[model samples]
Target: ISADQVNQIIYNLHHDPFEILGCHLLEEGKNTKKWVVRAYLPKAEAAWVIRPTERKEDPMNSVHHPNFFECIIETPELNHYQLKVKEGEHEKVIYDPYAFSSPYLTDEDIYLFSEGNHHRIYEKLGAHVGEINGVKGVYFAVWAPNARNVSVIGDFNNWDGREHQMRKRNYTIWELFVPEIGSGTVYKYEIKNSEGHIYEKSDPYGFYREVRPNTASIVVDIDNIYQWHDEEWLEKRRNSDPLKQPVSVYEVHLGSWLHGSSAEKMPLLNGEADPVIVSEWNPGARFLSYYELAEKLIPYVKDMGYTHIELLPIAEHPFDGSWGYQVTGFYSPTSRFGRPEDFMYFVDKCHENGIGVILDWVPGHFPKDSHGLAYFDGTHLYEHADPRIGEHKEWGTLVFNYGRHEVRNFLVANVLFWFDKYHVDGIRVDAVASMLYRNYLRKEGEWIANEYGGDEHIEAVSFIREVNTLLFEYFPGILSIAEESTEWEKVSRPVYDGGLGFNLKWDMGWMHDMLDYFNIDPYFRQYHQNNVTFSMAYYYNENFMLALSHDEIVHGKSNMLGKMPGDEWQKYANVRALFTYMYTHPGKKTMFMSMEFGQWSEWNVWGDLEWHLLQYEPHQQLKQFFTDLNALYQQEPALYTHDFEYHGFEWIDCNDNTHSVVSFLRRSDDPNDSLVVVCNFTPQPHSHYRIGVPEAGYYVELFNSDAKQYGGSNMGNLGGKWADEWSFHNKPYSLDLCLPPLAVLILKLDPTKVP
Candidate 1:
C-alpha cells in the first residue's frame, strides 16, 4: 500500500484493539506513495495492509499522518509483496502475501512468546498494553527488600495505605496497577514492619516533585513538556568566544533582591552598629517589574560597563533562609516569585539586552528534608548509604554519590539540560571547597587521608574533571566559575592537566585581606604589608575575580562602606579610594548588592534591601563612585588590557607610616598612552603634593574620587598640567598639585596632544 493509506489505517486504529506491529513506506521509480502496515489481532494473528496509488514513490513520508504522506520503507522483510488492490472498500489478502516465509518457517513462535506474554498481562489486568503502558494510568513498583507489607497512600487511593497495598511478585519487588492517574496526583508509599511500625516513603525515580515540606511526589507525564524559545540564542552563543568576552557580575538573591508588596521593608542598623554618623542625602532611582528589570538593569549595567548578570541560586528550594543553597527539586525552578516560564522570560530578556546570565549552581550538598534527595527509594539512591560518608556534618545536608555512573549521568545531564533548555551562559559553582577535600572541616586525626596522604578526595576530583570536560566539549561559550577558597592549585586549569577546568576562581584571600586592612585604622595598615602585595604571586596562573561577595555582608558582618574605620566623611572618602585601588588592581572585581550604595545593614533574605538608605550622602557618594568607576574601566584600555600578563602594572611608590600615599602606573602595550593612579589614604588634605608622571608634557585629571558627584568635599584640584621641564629628583617631570585626603586621582597623558 501507499504511505498515505498506511497512515490512514494507523490513524483509524490508534485507540483500537489491534496493536501496531510495524509500519514502513516504499519508494519505486520517480513517484513514491506506497506504504505497508503490519498489526496483530487480539488473540488471533498478524495482518498486513497496503495502499496502491498512481504515484510510484513519495519523498515526504512519515508515521505522523496528515502532515506528509510520502515515505520510503527499506527493509528485507518487504522484498516482494502480492498486490491485492481494491478501488473502494473491497480488498483481499492473497495467499503468501508480502513474503515466502510462513509462521512455521520464520520461527514465529517467539512472536507468540512476546505478544502473548504482553497480551496475557493486558487480558488479566483489563487495560491496553502499548508503548505508553503506565503513562496515562499508574503502574506502581516498590523496592521493599525486607518489608512484609507495603501499601500506597495517596489522593488516588483516598490516603488509605491498606486499600491499594501492593502485591508481591518476588522476594523484593512489589507492584500495583491503577488507571488514569494522569498527572498532578500526589502519592507516597507506606511500609509496615514486623512489629507493625509503619514508615512513609516517596518515589526516588519520580518525574516530578513539589517544593520542600511537601512529602509527596506528583505523577508527571514526560510527554507533555513545554516548548522553549531560546534556539536562536543558543546558536548565536555557540559561535562566539566566551572566554574573551567581558564579564562583570552582579550577584543577587531573588528572594531578597526585591520583595513583593505584601512583605515589609527590612530595617537598618541591626548588626554590631558603627556609631559614626555620615551625611544623609538620597540618590535618585525608580522601580521596575521583574520583566522590566531586564530592560532597566541591563542598560544600567551596560552603561556602567558590565557584561554579565550572576544570579544567586534559583532552583526550587523550600526555605528562603538557605539562600537557595538547599535545593529540593532538581528539575523545577522555584515558583515562589513567578512561574518556570516566567523565569525563562527573565533570562530571555537578559540575553535580548546583550547581557549573559550565569546561574549560581549548588551541587555540593542538599537539605535533609523528607521530600528531598535524602534516603530516597527507601535507601540512599542519590547519596551514599552510609551516613558517615554521605552526610555533611557542618551543613547538615546529604552529599551525592559521585562514584555511581547513573548518578554522574544525572548531574551531567542536568547541567546540559539547563544549558540546552534555558540558554544560560554559565554557572558559578558554589561550595566547591566542600566538594574537593574529604576532611575539609574534620578535626585533627578525625579522618583518614587519601593514598597520597592528602585531604583531597580522588573520586570527587575525578567527577569534577569529568564534569568540566563534558561541559567544555558539549557547550560552547559557556564559562564555569569555581567558588573554591582553598589553595587548591590548578583549580582553574584545564581538565587535561588533572585539574577542574574552571574559567575563573574567586580570590577570597584578596577580599579578606583587603577588607581587614580597611577595617583597621589607617595608621596601623603599615603592619599588614603582605595583605596588598602577596596576591601578585598567583596573579598570572589563571583568571581570578576579586570579590566582596554576599557572605561578608550577611550574618551581621559590616557592609563594605561600614567596614571602613574612619569618620562619616572619611569613610565615604575611604570607600572611594578603595574602589580606585580595586579597579586598578590586576584581576576582575565583583561587589555585592547594596554595597555600591553603602548599605549599613546586613542582608535579610525575606525582604527587599534597605534601598532607602541611598538617600544618605555617604551612600549616594559610594553609588556614584562605583558607577563612574565602572564607566572609567570600560573607557580606559590601560586598566585591564594586559591583565593576564605580567609587567602590565608598575608601582611608582608606596610610602607607609609616613602619609599613607600609594601610587601606581598602568601601561598598555603601546607605551605612548598610560594612566597614573595616586591614592591618598589619610584623612588630612595635602598641598603641593608632587606626583610623578610616566611622560610629562600635559596631563589631564581623568577621574578624581573626591569630585562632588561622588559625595566628596569638592576639595580636588579641578584640572592639572605637568610640564616636561620639571624633573623632580632625577625622575621624569612631575606635577605639583593639591591632593585631597582619602581620595584617588587618575591622570591620563595623551601622546598625540603632547609637544
Candidate 2:
C-alpha cells in the first residue's frame, strides 16, 4: 500500500509483517478493489499468485521494492493461495506459509506456560515436525517477551530473516509453520529487540544441536527416532526400592574414558610417556562415539559388578573444558558422539545389560556464550540484570534467575524431559549448595537477603521442592540425588517433612575424611585416628552415598592411587584397606572410572585413561581387588539393607587410637545375616587382636584384603577363627584374630563349622 511499508518489510525491521506482506484488502473508492495478495521473495525475478477452484494465475508487479511484489485479484474475500516465483532460470510454485490461518498452540498451553506449570512445554516450544492441512513441515515457537521482531533463519531460506518472519502470539511467544522442511534442518532464531539491536540464539529446547563451534539448533523428530526396548527393566525398577538394594556406581566422563585407535600412537609432549602431561587442548583426541561406548563401556561395567553408570554432564555445550556443565542446550543430547538416536541406543544397551544410567545435571549456572541463553533477545531475559545476584564469579558463569516463573518452568520441565525422553534412571544434581544459599561463596555486600532476612534462596528452594515432588510422583523408582556439600539438614528427606526431598545426598564429609586419613603417614595415623572415626558421628542424618567422585582426581588433587602416602607396594595395601572400609561402611558406593584401575596421574580431560597401566601386574591386581570387592558388596544383603538406620551398624572399638584399628558389625533386617568387620590402618601386623563377636561359634573368614591374589602379604587366619567364651568390648563372645597390616578382615558365623 505504501513505499515505507514495503521498505520496512524488505529491510526486516517490521514488527508486524502480517499487516503488510500477506493477502489483504484495499478500500480505494466506493467500488473498491476487494482482495490483494503480496509476497516478499528476495530471490525472485518475477512472481504470480495461484488460487484454487478456478486454478487462476494472476501476475503480480514489483511496484515499490524489487523483492516486494503485490497483485490485485477480483475475489469475493481473502482466501488461501500459492506463490509462483521465478529465480534464475526455473520457476516453482509453493504454498505461502504466511497464508495459513490455524494456530499451532492451544489457548490452554499458553495459559499453563505463563503459570509456570507447563510440564510438557518442550513438546510445543522448539522446532517440531508437524502436519498442517495435510501439508508436512516443521513448526517453531520461542519465548522472548522483550523482542520487537523475531524470524526463523535457516539453510532453507538462505539464512535470511526477512523471508520467514514469524507471527507473534499473545504477549511473548512467536510462531511459524514452514512448509517443506523436516527433520535435520539446521536453524536459529534471529531476533531484534525494542532498541533495534539484533541477536541470534540457539533454541533453548532444541532436541539436537550441531557439534561444538557450529552453533545451530537441529530439527530432530524424537518420537520417530528409535523405539525403546527396556520395558522389563523399567517395570522391575518401578517396583523395587533402591535404598534396600545394592548401588555400586561407576562414574565416567564419556569422552575421556577411553580412546579409539588414534590413541595408540598419540604424540607425547616433552617426551613424557604419560599422556596427562599435555601441552595443548585437544578435545577430539581419539574420542569414542556413543555406539563405541555401548560396545566397550557397557560390558566393562557389567563385568565390574557395578549396578549403575553415572555419566558426567552430556548436555550440549560449546566448551569441552567445562565437562558438559556449562549447558547451552537443555533438551539436546550432545552431537559430539553421535546423533540423538545413537545416544538413545547407548542408554538402551545400558538398561539391557542390567546397569542404570545417572546423568550429572547442572541447573545452577550457564556460560555466557553469545549464541547461548545469556542476554537472550538483546536483554537479560534468562539471567538477572544485577551481577551480584546473577553471576558466579568463580566459574565465570551466570546463575539462572530461579525466581522468574518462566525460568523455573524451563528448568523444572527440562528435568522431566530427560526422564520422559531419554529414560535415565537417576539425575545427580550438581552444585545444589550454590542454588540453595544466596550468600554462598559471597562477601557480605555481594548478596541480598530474603524477605525474612535469611541467607537461603527461597525461590530456588521452592523450585527444587516442586521438581523433586513431581519427579517422585511421576517416576516411581527414579532417583533425584544431590551433590550438596554443606550442612543442609534433611536434604534427602521427603517434602511433606519440610525437607529438600532428594532420594540421596553424596557424603562429601566422608569422602574428604577418608582421603585425608589415607594421605597421612602410618606413624602419624594413630594420632589422627579421629579422622577415620568421625564419619559415623553423624552418618544417620541423611540418606547418604559414599562417592569418591571426579572432583578428587583433577586440579592437582592426584588420582586415587597417587593420593597414597607410601611407595608402590604400600600404596596398594593402603588402597585395599581403604576400599574395603568404604564398602563395609553403611552407605551406597560410587567410584570414579580410573580409580578402580589405579591410574597414576591426575585426570586429564584432553586425554583418555592410562589403559596401558593394566598391562602391569600391580594394576591388574588392583582391578581384581575392586572387581571382587564390588561383587562382595552386591552379594551381601547386610551391606545394603537398613543402610539409613542406626540398627544396621554398631561400632565395636572406635577408640583404639594406639593401634589405629577399629571393628564394627553390619547387620541386615534379619540379625542372623551379620558380618564382623575389622580395619587395621597401620603397617604393623597385630597378633592375637581381640574383637567382639555376637555368637560362640566357628567364625569363618569371609574375605581378607591381604590375600596373595590381590598383591597383599597374604597374612590372615587360616580359614576360620573360633569365638572364645569370654567378654571383650562389651560382647559375651570374642575372636582372637591375627590382623593383617594395612588390611581389613571380614568374618561371618558358619553354623555348619560350629562345634
Candidate 3:
C-alpha cells in the first residue's frame, strides 16, 4: 500500500483494511521472500508473528505508525498466523482480525434486495456473530452507496473505527469480519460518507441497544439467546381463524401499565412529587422486568378473559413520552423492561397462557435523533430528500421513503423479525393512513404529487401491500392489523381481492361515534342517538375492532370515567353501557388498561396505573363488571362467531330514539343461538320496555350492566322473561323488560352456550 492509503488505514478512514494489513504476496526471485505479513497493534510496544500449531515465533518491527507493525518472514507464505502483542508488561495473543475474508453474499440476495423483494434482509446485513474457519467473531455489513468508507467500531477496539475498515462490495455494501468481538460488546458504525463527513451510527438491524441516554447498540448472538416454547400455541394459531374467534384485547403501555416499586426516591427537578427522571431513565425501580411482567401482566390479561394483550410499541425509543412511536432502535426491545431474551420469556408466557401478544408497530415515521436512522450515510438513505415526502410535521419525525428498495426491505423484514424471533402473535401497524396518502397533514403546494400526478402515495401502497402479503404468506395465523383512519376500501381484504391485505382494521370511526354519543348530555342524547347506530351502516366493510385506545386518555382528552355525561351514578352507568355496547356491537373488543378499573385521572406516561383504586367499591365493582363481560363474551358463539358478516347482526329496533333506546340481535353461525342487546341512553329507566327477539323461547338475562354486583341499580326482571308471541320490530317474539337507567341488557335465547 502507498503512503496516501497508508494514512487512510492509520487514521481509521480506510474502506478496506483487507488489502493493507493482511498477507500480500511478493513476486521476487527464487532467493527472495514470497509473502509479507502485517499486523496492526494500535497500542502495543512490541509484537511477534506465531503459528499456534507450529509454535514458531518471530519478532516484527514497527515501521510507519505506532500501531502498524510489519515484517517479511523467512516462511514465504503466511498461513493462519496470530499476533502476540505486549504493552507495559501486559501481553496477550490475538488472531489477526483482518487475516480472514468474509463469505461473500449471493448475487441473488443483492438482486432481490435491490428489487425491494427481500423479506429477510436482516439475515445478511447488520452485526451477526459468525465464525470463519475455527475462530468466532462478529461479522459486520452495512449498505451505504454514498459512503466513501465504513468501519465497524466497538468496545473491543476501544471504539476505534480504523482498526476494522470494511471492504466495499458492488459499490453499495461494506463488510468486515472482526475477531475477538462477540456477544455483549457495545458497537456502532463509523461512516465517512461521500461528503467526507465522518459520523457514527447505530446498526439498523441491531437486536439490542443501550438504554436511552447511552445510544450504542449491543452485540447479541440472537440465534443463541432465544428458544421457542410456544410451538403448541403457534400450531393452534395456524389452524384457527382469528376472524371467527373471541378476541378481547387488553391494550397496555408496558412501562406505565404497572411497576415493581417506588421504594427509592429520586432528587426531583422541581419538587418531590414531580417527574421521576431516574426511575424512568434508569432501570432499577422505574420499569418492571419482562419476566416480572410475564408473571403479572399475562395472568391478569388471561384472568380478565382477554384473548390478546396489545402492547404499546415495545421497540427502543429515546423519549418515553412518545410511548415508542418515536423509535430509534427498531429491532431491539426497550431495555427499560429487560434484555431481548427476557422479552422472549414475556411473549412465551403469553402464548402458553393462551393470550396472544400484539406489538404496536410504527412504519409511518421515526424520530430524527442523531444516533438513529435519520440522514444516514450523510444523505437521505432511509428517508426522502424532499421534506414534503420525508418529514412528519406534527410529530417532528422523519418518514421512511417507501420507494427506496433497500428502505422497504429494511422495514418489511423488521416486521417479520418480531414474529420469527420473539413469537409475537400480531402487529398493529400505526398511522397507516398517513403512509397511504401523500398530502396527509400537508399544506397546499407543500406536498409533492406522485408520478401519476396524484396525492396518493402509490409507492407506499405497493410496499404496504407486499408487507401484508409476505407476512401472512410466511407466518400463518399471524395477525397484520392496520390502524388506519381513512375510508381506504378493502383494507382487511385478502391481496387476491385487489386490496391492502390486513387481517383486521381498527374501527376509529366507531370509537369516535360511540365516545361522542356517550359524552353528550342526556337532554341532547336524543338528538345525537344516530351516532350509536351509525356504525352498523359500515360494520361489515372490513374486519373491524372497536378500540378505546390510549390516544383518548391523554393530551387533555379525558379518561373513560371522565368522558361520560352526568354526575357520579349516571357517569358510572354510562361507562357500563358504553363498554357493554362495545363488546356486543358486532366487532372485536380492545380497551386501554386504566379504563378497565375506572381510573378517572388522565394517563400519565411515566406513572404506574391507579392500582389503589381497586380498594374502593366503585372501581372494584367496575373491574368485576369488565371481567364478567369479557367472560360472557368469550363463552358465547353468538357474540364472536360471525363478527364480520351481515348474517351475524340484525337490528330489532335501532330507530327508536325518542326515549333514546335501541335493541339489536347478534347471531352465531347457527341461527338457533342468538342474543338481544337493549341499551337505555337516559336516566329514565323503562319498566315495560318491549324489545323484539328472533326466537320464541325463553329470553334468558345473560348479562345486565345494571346488576347489583356491578354497582348498578339492580332494576330488572328477577328470573328473566320468556319471549311472548308478540310481533315487534319485524320479529316473531318480543319481551316486556325493564331497561335500567343508562344501562345495557344482554339477553340470550339459549343458555346451553354459557361457559
Quote each prediction's TM-score: 0.72, 0.84, 0.83
Quote the lDDT for 71 in model 3.
67
Q: Sort the candidates on TM-score, descending order.
A: 2, 3, 1
Residue 604's C-alpha lDDT in candidate 1?
66
Separately for all candidates shown, the number of backbone clashes (residues 3 or more apart, or on different chains) is 21, 0, 1
Model 2 residue 690 CA deviation in Å: 0.9
What tens-digit string does per-residue lDDT give for candidate 3 at 1-755?
45676678888898878887866776665765566677777778898876533447788887667667886765533544667777666665544766544534556667778877665577678788877666888888888888889898888889888868999888778888888778988989999977789888998888888877778999888867767677668767866788899998999998798765446532221212212233535445456667678878888888878999999999988888888888989989987766888888888889889899999998889988888999888889999889998998987889899999899989988998888778888999888889999998999999989998988899899988988877775566777888888798999998789889999999999999988888889878889878988888887889998899999999888998899888998889999999998899988888999998899999988778889999999998998999999999988999999998888888888777788998888888777677888888888988877887766777778888999899999987775787789988887878999888888888877545333
Top candidate, metric TM-score: 2
Model 3 misplaced stretches (Cα beyond 4 Å): 1-104, 262-285, 751-755
429-456: candidate 1 lDDT, tens digit per residue? 8879888887877676666677899887
Better of 1 and 3 by TM-score: 3
lDDT of 2 by residue, 1-755 (tens): 88988888888889878776677767545554567788899889899986633347799999788888998887654343567778776565554656533337777678778888777788789998988888999999999988999999998998997989998988879999999999989999999998999889999989998877788999999888887888778767766889889999999998789875534432321121212212135533556667678888999999988999999999998877888899999889887776778778889999999999999998989999999999887778888778877888877999888888888989988998888788889999988999998898889899999899999989889989988887776565877899888888989999889999998999999999999999999888888889888888998889999999999999999998788888888899998999999999999999999999899989888778999999999999989998999899988889999798888899988888988899999999776779999999998999998998978899888899999889999999998799999899999999999999899998888877736
Let me know the TM-score candidate 2 reaches against the reference structure: 0.84
Candidates arranged by lDDT, highest first: 2, 3, 1
Once model 1 is optimally superposed onto the true structure by TM-score, how far is the C-alpha of residue 411 displaced, in angstroms? Answer: 2.3
